[PDB]
Amino acid sequence: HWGYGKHNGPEHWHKDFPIAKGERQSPVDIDTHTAKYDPSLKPLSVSYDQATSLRILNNGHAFNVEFDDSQDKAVLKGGPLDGTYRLIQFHFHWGSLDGQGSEHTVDKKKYAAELHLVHWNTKYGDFGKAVQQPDGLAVLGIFLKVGSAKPGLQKVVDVLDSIKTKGKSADFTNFDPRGLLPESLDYWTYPGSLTTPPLLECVTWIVLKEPISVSSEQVLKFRKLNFNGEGEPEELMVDNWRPAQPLKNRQIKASFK
Ligand SMILES: CCCCc1ccc(S(N)(=O)=O)cc1
Ligand SMILES: OC[C@H]1O[C@@H](O)[C@H](O)[C@@H](O)[C@@H]1O
Numbered sequence: 001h002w003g004y005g006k007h008n009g010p011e012h013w014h015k016d017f018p019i020a021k022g023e024r025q026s027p028v029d030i031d032t033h034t035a036k037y038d039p040s041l042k043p044l045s046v047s048y049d050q051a052t053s054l055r056i057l058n059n060g061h062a063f064n065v066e067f068d069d070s071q072d073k074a075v076l077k078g079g080p081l082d083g084t085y086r087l088i089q090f091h092f093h094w095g096s097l098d099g100q101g102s103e104h105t106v107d108k109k110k111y112a113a114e115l116h117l118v119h120w121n122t123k124y125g126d127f128g129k130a131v132q133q134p135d136g137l138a139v140l141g142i143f144l145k146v147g148s149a150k151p152g153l154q155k156v157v158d159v160l161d162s163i164k165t166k167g168k169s170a171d172f173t174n175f176d177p178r179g180l181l182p183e184s185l186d187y188w189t190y191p192g193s194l195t196t197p198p199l200l201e202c203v204t205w206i207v208l209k210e211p212i213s214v215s216s217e218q219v220l221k222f223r224k225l226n227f228n229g230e231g232e233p234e235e236l237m238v239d240n241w242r243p244a245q246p247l248k249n250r251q252i253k254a255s256f257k
């Protein structure tokens, strides 16, 4: 099956997922000079006060922190979005070294990691129906650089030892995703896709300009996870990022002048 290695990584995905060569694939390089301020963007609203986290899962590609999305609790609205998008999960992509790991790049610069907060458009009822729609999903992307520790990340870091291998999960209630945000909500936005198979072209991307800082020790613990299952040969979960894809017939808009 698909993965990130030489034999099953991003350059192979198109064989089983031909949309990998499509017209609105993600991630992309964000050329900051060409991105244009868009006065039609409404204020962005990240409303996570009532978020209900449930569980953390190693799915063999990353780890997902899952939320109860059975009601409007944690939601994203405003900005480029029409209507209400409900938080379902977050996960990260990261590197083997601090010099790589992000999926989006900024003037070609790669960050150490990238956080994706995944939301679905409530007008479509369920995530599965949302991924049949061209405006089904909104992903809030946040870059990570290595410097000072992020206190709100430490609870995630400390549970990773309990989900080392593919298929393991752990209770992860009462986690507040507000502790993963930077100060500023300045962002870039463009229409794109999921960055892993099935690569579906459903996503409004909202990528924050301000990175969060995490410590070297925090990211080193991400890199102790395993792609493999229990009892199988150890393959460190590192470099689980897709490189930038062709921009094609798209424009990146900025929320800030
Ligand atoms: C049909 C299940 C799809 C799950 C999925 C959700 C989000 C992303 S990402 N990396 O944020 O674009 C990738 C995959
Ligand atoms: O025709 C002019 C228009 O061109 C578009 O490509 C830009 O997105 C708009 O901001 C601009 O007003």
Ligand SMILES: [Zn+2]
Binding pocket: 091, 092, 093, 116, 195
């Ligand atoms: Zn992702």
